[PDB]
Amino acid sequence: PQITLWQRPLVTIRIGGQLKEALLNTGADDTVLEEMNLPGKWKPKMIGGIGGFIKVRQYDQIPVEICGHKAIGTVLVGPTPVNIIGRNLLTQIGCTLNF
Amino acid sequence: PQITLWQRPLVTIRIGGQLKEALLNTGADDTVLEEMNLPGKWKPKMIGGIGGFIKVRQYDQIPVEICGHKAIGTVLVGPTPVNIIGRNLLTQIGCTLNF
Numbered sequence A, B: 001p002q003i004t005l006w007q008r009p010l011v012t013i014r015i016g017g018q019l020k021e022a023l024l025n026t027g028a029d030d031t032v033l034e035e036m037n038l039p040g041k042w043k044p045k046m047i048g049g050i051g052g053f054i055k056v057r058q059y060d061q062i063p064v065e066i067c068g069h070k071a072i073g074t075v076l077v078g079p080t081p082v083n084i085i086g087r088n089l090l091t092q093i094g095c096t097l098n099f
């Protein structure tokens, strides 16, 4: 589809069997989701942004469905105010910026 | 142009007479540049990111050129790990998300 930027780019995503509201983020390397109890092995990690770093748990090859499209990759989970879908997954659903 | 997301979406911008590199960011509402001197009166503001809140200097109605396209709006200057162009300026140059 085509998404304008007047409003925050919120879309519906399906992960771990649940449907969630995530923000499309060209400015995020990784994908960070609100704390949730996922199955699987996970390594500890530190990621930063404006304001500093926060510790998150890293899960690999997690199947995610973004607005109908299907992708699968790394997902960081932690103390975040919103679900951030980063470039790692955006590339997988053929998403681009145009102006 | 059509920018893919296999690599950080960086672009060259021109502002205050200088050139700086900036990350086109759809997940950001505001535009925050690293600490630099800009003409004009400025007001103290605070913004929150993933790592928390930070203090910034706000400049309104400032002209910015993003890959040749002109935009005029608020620009926040503070201690950020990188220069980011937000939705307030991306909308001005008719930028969208596609896939």
Ligand SMILES: CC(C)(C)NC(=O)[C@@H]1C[C@@H]2CCCC[C@@H]2CN1C[C@@H](O)[C@H](Cc1ccccc1)NC(=O)[C@H](CC(N)=O)NC(=O)c1ccc2ccccc2n1
Pocket: A025, A026, A027, A028, A029, A030, A031, A032, A047, A048, A049, A050, A080, A081, A082, A084, A086, B023, B025, B026, B027, B028, B029, B030, B031, B032, B047, B048, B049, B050, B081, B082, B084
């Ligand atoms: C600029 C401002 C208006 C304050 N907004 C934002 O920061 C909003 C805030 C939202 C609510 C909280 C959760 C994140 C979302 C999305 N972000 C936008 C979002 O695009 C933000 C922009 C950014 C880019 C580079 C450096 C810092 C910050 N990206 C991020 O926060 C991602 C998070 C991640 N680990 O994937 N960080 C990075 O992509 C990133 C890249 C390089 C870095 C180098 C050193 C230190 C930290 C670095 N972080």
